Amino acid sequence: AISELHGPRLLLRAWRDSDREAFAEMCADPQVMEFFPSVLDRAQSDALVDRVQAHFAERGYGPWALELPGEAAFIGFTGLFDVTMDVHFAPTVEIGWRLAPAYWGRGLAREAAETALDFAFERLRLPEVVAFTTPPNRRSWGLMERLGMRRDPAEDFDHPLLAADHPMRRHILYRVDAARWAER
Ligand SMILES: CC(C)(COP(=O)(O)OP(=O)(O)OC[C@H]1O[C@@H](n2cnc3c(N)ncnc32)[C@H](O)[C@@H]1OP(=O)(O)O)[C@@H](O)C(=O)NCCC(=O)NCCS
Ligand SMILES: [Ca+2]
């Protein structure tokens, strides 16, 4: 029984088996997956869910499944994931998000992220949370900066889990520390 979190509209909860079909549909959508190397099939979507569930088991937090009580059982994920890869800003905790496209444009990722960052800073009492994306993914880094996260362009980096010559290799880094979060 992991910690569920609430916003005014959203419930951030543990993943359920019944989420897997809806999540696979999202991960097969080229508009959802545009700024990733490819769309995913069901097996790959399920492997991602399994990784998330292992993270929750090990850490007590993770990328929560998003439910919209009064509206929809599952609309995607938003939450925290430990950064352990060989990058300059590791080790730390990242925040990220993936919403079904019918739910974009509503401030729902913003609300989910605010809820997750409140947990990060108030409950976990983390010193900092980061987020990273590619330059063309304006919807994603726009959300980062709207949350109050900030970027130093000198901290751009090549993603180490991508090939050294991969077209999407260059990522940008945003950070928010506990003090900056408290000042809002
Ligand atoms: C990144 C992603 C989660 C952003 O979702 P989003 O809906 O655009 O983000 P927000 O929740 O902040 O909503 C902001 C939009 O809602 C609108 N909005 C409406 N009501 C709002 C409210 N109450 N609060 C905030 N914004 C509101 C804003 O005007 C903005 O619209 P705009 O883009 O047309 O200007 C989504 O595009 C996505 O899932 N992308 C695919 C997966 C992905 O690339 N993930 C990131 C990998 S790094
Ligand atoms: Ca263990």
For 37, the token pair is 């190397």
Q: Whose CA is nearest to atom 34 of ligand 1?
A: 105
Task: DSSP for the chain, please give it.
Answer: -PPPEE-SS-EEE---GGGHHHHHHHHT-TTTSTTSS----HHHHHHHHHHHHHHHHHHS--EEEEEETTTEEEEEEEEEEEE-SSSTT-SEEEEEEEE-GGGTTSSHHHHHHHHHHHIIIIIS--SEEEEEE-TT-HHHHHHHHHTT-EE-GGG-EE-TTS-TT-TT-EEEEEEEEHHHHH--
- Ligand 1 site-directed mutation target among 110, 132, 144, 147, most atoms within 8 Å of CB: 110
Place of tokens 């109050």: 148
Residue 144 labelled as part of a binding site: yes
- What's the structural domain count of the chain? 1
Q: How many CA atoms lie within 13 A of 168 on its CB side?
A: 13
Helix pair 20-27, 42-59: axis angle to 10 deg: 120
For 139, the token pair is 């919807």
Q: Whose CA is nearest to atom 19 of ligand 1?
A: 106
Q: Whose CA is nearest to atom 46 of ligand 1?
A: 140
| Rounded-to-integer distance, Cα 166 and Cα 151, Å | 22
Q: How was this structure determined?
A: X-ray
> Residue 92, exposed/middle/buried by CB under 10 A (0-12, 13-18, 19+)?
middle
- Ligand 1 site-directed mutation target among 99, 114, 170, most atoms within 8 Å of CB: 99
| Rounded-to-integer distance, Cα 96 and Cα 82, Å | 11
Q: Give the structural domain span for 123.
A: 1-184
